[PDB]
């Protein structure tokens, strides 16, 4: 056999074609004498003189082998001649042909595109609350709240304004206005703004008093004293005091609108930053002056 045995190797199946004149001797063989393993031929090609085997690769006496590159299915096409009829005689020689089908063993595979998904989060929020203050009459040492609200003329009314700090950044408290009235209405007449113009304690300036901002025991506290008084036409004794209180951080710069000033032989700033108070000497207030006459000897 030289060009006798041909093969086509498919995925599931091997297709073997043998020339009927297997030996190229001019005389065809018995298709019953040619067996692929133990399998007989499947069909005949009376025009191509081809005996056609078809076997799935695991059948018909197939041996499966592994190599680096390939899988090998090795078959054996065996020609075992049998007697030519009642005669115990054979006119051909026995033979076997080895048929191999190689198959690529190793492969790499890929998927189509996957698209990852996630939901990110991005937002802004605001929230609000109030800083809480206390305005309370206190004692001569601005240490304890005064048990009673009654004073005589010529006493000093000690008052402390405080912003409660809790867990806040160091706060500073400011008192920028206070209006005294007979009726609880802060706009009622008569009225007297003993503190005004962003912290100017104008009482000591207009009345010639010792009313002043004593000191700040802490930044969130401001102590001041106001020498008592009455209104000209007042029959009642009770006087209502209404103040505006502000607060910032201790790191906020002292300003012309952030100050506590008092006139002590010149406008003076508690904390000692006296120049800040220059603008307390505005218009709108008229310093008191007692009258004058010429010298006489008693």
């Amino acid at each position: 056999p030289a060009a006798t045995v041909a093969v086509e190797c498919r995925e599931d199946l091997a297709h073997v074609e043998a020339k009927k004149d297997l030996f190229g001797i001019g005389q065809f063989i018995d298709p019953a004498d040619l067996t692929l393993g133990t399998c007989p031929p499947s069909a005949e090609d009376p025009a191509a003189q081809v005996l056609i085997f078809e076997s799935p690769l695991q059948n018909c006496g197939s041996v499966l082998t592994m190599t680096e590159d390939s899988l090998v299915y090795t078959f054996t096409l065996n020609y075992n001649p049998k007697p030519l009829g009642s005669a115990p005689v054979v006119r051909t020689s026995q033979a076997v042909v080895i048929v191999e089908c190689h198959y690529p063993r190793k492969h790499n595979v890929s998927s189509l595109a996957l698209d990852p998904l996630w939901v990110p989060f991005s937002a802004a929020k605001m929230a609000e609350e109030f800083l809480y203050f206390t305005l309370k009459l206190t004692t001569d040492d601005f240490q304890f709240e005064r048990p009673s609200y009654q004073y005589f003329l010529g006493d000093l009314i000690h008052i402390e304004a405080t912003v409660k700090q809790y867990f806040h950044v160091p706060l500073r408290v400011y008192v920028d206005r206070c209006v005294a009235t007979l009726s609880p209405d802060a706009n009622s007449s008569p009225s007297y703004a003993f503190i005004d113009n962003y912290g100017c304690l104008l009482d000591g300036r207009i009345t010639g008093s010792d009313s002043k901002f004593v000191s700040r025991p802490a930044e969130n506290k401001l102590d001041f004293q106001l020498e008592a008084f009455r209104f000209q036409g007042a029959d009642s004794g009770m006087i209502y005091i209404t103040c505006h209180l502000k607060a910032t951080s201790a790191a906020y710069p002292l300003d012309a609108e952030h100050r506590a000033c008092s006139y002590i032989q010149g406008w003076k700033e508690v904390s000692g930053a006296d120049p800040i108070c220059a603008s307390c000497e505005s218009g709108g207030f008229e310093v008191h002056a007692n009258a004058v006459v010429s010298h006489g000897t008693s």
Partner: protein, 165 residues
């Protein structure tokens, strides 16, 4: 002495992503997934991070049950080219990559799967991710592709056709 004829023949391997949906709440999700597989039209396929991606690798058109498909390295890329970088490892030497917290897993494909040739298939799952620029540690916002090296294997030889892990 004898004659010997030899020729080549095709042998193909195919990878697909499962899209099976759990029958009812409570079912075995891993089993329910491989009851269906995405087609080409379905891609690109959106899947959220950390979600299980079920994968099936398969030899096509064979009928010899002795063949065993064995997986080698299964990895991921940002582009279709599997040799392209960056890369993440899902399987190495046929066993889940060990330096991943969201560990990958191999899915046993026993008779419960009920396949005509369960040996021809090899299944595995990984947890969905997205590639990141390591320098900025920020999402690359790029697609992902899944790749596997495979080998058809024959038991009874000197070689082993299953991964010890």
């Amino acid at each position: 002495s004898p004659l010997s004829i030899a020729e080549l023949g095709p042998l193909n391997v195919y990878l697909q992503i499962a899209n099976g949906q759990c029958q009812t709440k409570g079912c075995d999700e891993a089993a329910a997934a491989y009851t269906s597989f995405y087609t080409d039209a379905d891609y690109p396929v959106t899947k959220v991070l950390r979600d299980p991606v079920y994968v099936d690798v398969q030899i096509l058109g064979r009928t010899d049950p002795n063949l065993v498909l064995t997986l080698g390295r299964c990895w991921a890329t940002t582009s279709p080219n599997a040799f392209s970088l960056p890369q993440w490892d899902i399987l190495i030497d046929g066993c889940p990559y060990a330096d991943d917290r969201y560990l990958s897993a191999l899915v046993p494909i026993d008779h419960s799967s009920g396949l005509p040739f369960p040996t021809h298939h090899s299944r595995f799952l990984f947890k969905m991710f997205t590639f990141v620029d390591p320098h900025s540690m920020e999402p690359l916002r790029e697609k992902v592709y899944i790749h596997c090296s495979t080998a058809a294997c024959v038991p009874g030889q000197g070689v082993s056709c299953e991964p010890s892990c």
